[PDB]
């Protein structure tokens, strides 16, 4: 997964 800001 991705968490944060992209």
mmCIF file with all atom_site columns, C-alpha atoms in Angstrom:
data_model
loop_
_atom_site.group_PDB
_atom_site.id
_atom_site.type_symbol
_atom_site.label_atom_id
_atom_site.label_alt_id
_atom_site.label_comp_id
_atom_site.label_asym_id
_atom_site.label_entity_id
_atom_site.label_seq_id
_atom_site.pdbx_PDB_ins_code
_atom_site.Cartn_x
_atom_site.Cartn_y
_atom_site.Cartn_z
_atom_site.occupancy
_atom_site.B_iso_or_equiv
_atom_site.pdbx_formal_charge
_atom_site.auth_seq_id
_atom_site.auth_comp_id
_atom_site.auth_asym_id
_atom_site.auth_atom_id
_atom_site.pdbx_PDB_model_num
ATOM 1 C CA . UNK A 1 1 ? 0.000 0.000  0.000  1.00 0.00 ? 1 UNK A CA 1
ATOM 2 C CA . UNK A 1 2 ? 0.865 3.601  -0.059 1.00 0.00 ? 2 UNK A CA 1
ATOM 3 C CA . UNK A 1 3 ? 0.317 5.955  2.778  1.00 0.00 ? 3 UNK A CA 1
ATOM 4 C CA . UNK A 1 4 ? 0.996 9.587  2.602  1.00 0.00 ? 4 UNK A CA 1
ATOM 5 C CA . UNK A 1 5 ? 1.409 12.095 -0.051 1.00 0.00 ? 5 UNK A CA 1
ATOM 6 C CA . UNK A 1 6 ? 2.145 11.535 -3.664 1.00 0.00 ? 6 UNK A CA 1
#
